[model samples]
Target: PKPGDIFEVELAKNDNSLGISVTGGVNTSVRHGGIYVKAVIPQGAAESDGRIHKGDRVLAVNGVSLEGATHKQAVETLRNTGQVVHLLLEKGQSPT
Candidate 1:
């Protein structure tokens, strides 16, 4: 798959972890990106990490790329990744 703007997210198995929900679909903005971070569970991994955001793009899990993966495929991959996960994400920003 072609590489585009991407971000990285890492989460481990714990009570305060990457508490996030993703949104993806035909008409959803996240469809263009990998997975749209619809919501981030307060005081979760995302909040603690302070890097993952609502508009960030989930590019990969562990090391497997999900550039063109379907929503279902992404979900399955994440699920199979188990509790601890390394995510590649793309934030809406440009490098200086």
Candidate 2:
């Protein structure tokens, strides 16, 4: 997907990250620390981490903002990292 491109679908899971499920699809926007996905796969590893959870939206990855990030970049940010990845989540939550 390109910048400013919008794709809509009844999202269940991101094609790259099966363990995390997307509750709803949003207009593909590439901005600094933009919210992309909400929710995770029930009982999945991501959930087991006890950090990311339902209704929590990931704003950034590894201290790097998502601004100008491509779809591939976002997914890679999560998978390429080691056991722990930094996610700039919404306020009032601890990042797993």
Candidate 3:
């Protein structure tokens, strides 16, 4: 995917895991300070769809914007999601 392009992906939540873990955020020490996928577990919801990928910056979750959320806030928001999650992601490179 080209940089600057945003993608919408709907992922179904598994029993106890969405299958994707995230890192970074506006409050983090990373260069961009954006929430991004740290890992995409194999056979998980995100991996099954084949759309969500590692390093994709999360712009929104369930229609809620994460433009200024901290790492804890972002993690809480994700954990609070229901069975389905509507994610708005921006194409990005992996955090070093």
Candidate 4:
């Protein structure tokens, strides 16, 4: 992993968790291919933290590997990992 590939977020209890949307799910064209970030909600945990970004490939959440996790499963992990979030990501291409 390169610099900016791994990042963390702290969510408050009862607060919205890491605000990211992903692709590769039952309804998407890439079904089960892998969880790829689609967007990081503005002013949300992800954006406010200033680490995660759209297109970053999520490798893991908390300590559990998301190597083959379904989209739903990946989301569950994020929502259930208490208030602290640890993410391993592969940085996507730089903006054109």
Clashes of each: 8, 1, 0, 0
The Cα local distance difference test for each model comes to 0.64, 0.47, 0.69, 0.61
Q: Write the per-residue lDDT of candidate 2 for residues 1-96, one digit (tens) a residue.
A: 333322221222223333665433234652443454455766554555444455545565545556655556666565675454345555323333
- TM-score of every candidate relative to the true structure: 0.68, 0.50, 0.74, 0.66
Task: List candidate 2 stretches off by more than 4 Å.
Answer: 1-18, 23-27, 30-35, 45-50, 91-96
| Candidate 4 per-residue C-alpha lDDT over 1-96 given as tens digits, one digit per residue, 9 for 90 to 100 | 455355444445334666678766433333334567788878476677566677776665655555456667766766676665556665665643
79, model 4: CA deviation in Å? 1.6
- Rank by TM-score (best first): 3, 1, 4, 2
lDDT winner between 1 and 3, please give it.
Answer: 3
Q: Report lDDT (Cα) of residue 91, candidate 4.
A: 69
What residue runs in model 4 are displaced by over 4 Å at the alpha carbon? 1-15, 25-33
Give candidate 1's whole-model lDDT: 0.64
Q: Which candidate should be chosen as best, given TM-score against the real structure? A: 3
Q: Compared with the true structure, what per-residue lDDT tens digits does model 1 show for residues 1-96?
A: 233465565668776446788876323345553677787778676677566666556666678765566777766776675567787776643322
Better of 1 and 2 by lDDT: 1
RMSD of 3: 3.7
